Structure formats: structure tokens, C-alpha cells
């Protein structure tokens, strides 16, 4: 079952007329493999469920795309004494992610070291 | 203008010779516009400075790429604490992002509502 079909089943189950709902798919969704498609499904289910539950909401906009991003990933074998990033370091990369329409994660890895990932779409 | 060698300057001023460093550039980095190139440079600088400040670090692996990601974006104009930002909400997002080798952000938007974005590479 294609990714789009799977995500639309989730939307069909959860969307309600009280939130005016728009869904836009762009890009080659058909090439997404089953494991990744499954993760996207789980995420959308959470995001749509929580939107519908969000007090006094009147609208819901869903955009799912496969598109070129820039990605910066940095892995080191150390861990920061005071957290995975300084306060103003988190602020900076988070603000840039927000500005770029992208996403940012930093973590102390389950079995040692630090991972940082930052991605944003090539276009807007 | 040349993005690979520009990001090398960031790495060279911080990582070398302090850390055993690997660097990979994948995809058409020449198509990255000036604004996004500036973000990538600033992110790398922060990420590399952070790694170098870790007392027990000996090694560093850098990957900068242009490649296809799946992106799921969901925006609503509801009020109060979104389910997305609760302990269990964030846990599920973080787990899936980690499993997929991706990333996510949840914003409460100052002007009202909640934005969620989750992305991960196709490969
Ligand atoms: Cl599809
Ligand atoms: Cl190129």
C-alpha cells in the first residue's frame, strides 16, 4: 500500500468537520520504503490526533512531501557535562531551523557520544 | 561559489588537529542558495564547537548532504498545551525520528497554535 493511501486512511479516521482540513502531497511519495512509510504513519497519527484534541481549533493543514533537503549531521564520541548543547546553542540552531522551515535534533546517544542533525528544504 | 570548501574552513578552524575527523559531502551542494548555505555554515560551526568542548571526545564524523527526505508537517490553530509537547508526545516523535535517522521540531506559534514538522532521509 502506497504512502499517500496509508496517510489518507489515518486522516479519514481522525479528521472531523470542526477543524477545516487541507492535505497536500507533493514529490515522489511512491518511492518511500515500508519501514519509513510506517514511521511517517505513526507520526501523522500522533500529530493529527493531537490537532483534533487541541482546544478550540478551527483548522488543520497537513503537508507531506518528498523533496530535497540540506542536511548537516555531526557525531562525536564525547558528551557535554552540562547537556547536549548550551542554552544559546540550542536557541541558535532551533531559530535557524524555524527560519529555514526545517528541523533540528541533538541528543546524547543511547550508548555513548553525541548526535546532532539539522535539515531544511532547498526551496522555502 | 563553492559550498564544500567553505564548510571546510569551519571544520579546519575548530576540529583540526584536536579530533580524528571524517568528512563526507553527498549530493548537489552547488544548488544550495545563499540563505541556506549561511544556515548550514552556522549550524556546522555550532555543532563542531560543541563536539570539541566534550572532554572525552577523540573523534568526529561530519556529513553534509543534499538528498531527498520525507517531511510531515502539521499545523493547527488550537489553544493550550498541544498533545505533541507532552512527555509521551515528544517521546513518540523522538523515538521515530531516531529510528528513521531523522529529526523533528514542535513549535507553539506565538500568534496561536502548534506547528509540527518531522523529516527523515529516504536513504
Ligand atoms: Cl504513494
Ligand atoms: Cl554539485
Swiss-Prot record, chain A:
The chain holds residues 451 to 573 of 573 of the full protein. Residues 1-123 are annotated as: ATP-binding domain. Disruption phenotype: Cells lacking this gene show no changes in gene induction following hypoxia, or exposure to NO or CO. Another publication shows a slightly reduced response to CO. Cells lacking both this gene and DevS (DosS) have no response to hypoxia, or exposure to NO or CO showing both proteins are required for the hypoxic, NO and CO responses. 30% decreased induction of the DevR (DosR) regulon during anaerobic growth, 50% decreased induction of the DevR regulon upon exposure to NO during aerobic growth. It is found in: Cytoplasm. Residues 1-123 form the Histidine kinase domain. It comes from Mycobacterium tuberculosis (strain ATCC 25618 / H37Rv). Induction: Expressed during aerobic growth, it is not further induced in hypoxia, or by nitric oxide (NO) or carbon monoxide (CO) treatment. Expression is not changed in a devR deletion mutant; i.e. it is not part of the dormancy regulon. The isolated ATP-binding domain (residues 451-573) crystallized as an asymmetric, domain-swapped dimer without ATP. This is Oxygen sensor histidine kinase response regulator DosT. Interacts with the two-component regulatory system DevR/DevS (DosR/DosS) involved in onset of the dormancy response. Required for full induction of the DevR (DosR) regulon; required during early adaptation to anaerobiosis, to start induction of the DevR regulon. May act as a direct hypoxia/oxygen sensor. O(2) acts as a switch, with the Fe(2+)-O(2)-bound protein inactive in autophosphorylation. Autophosphorylates under anaerobic but not aerobic conditions, binding of NO or CO has no effect on autophosphorylation. Binds a number of gases; O(2), NO, CO. May be a secondary sensor for CO.
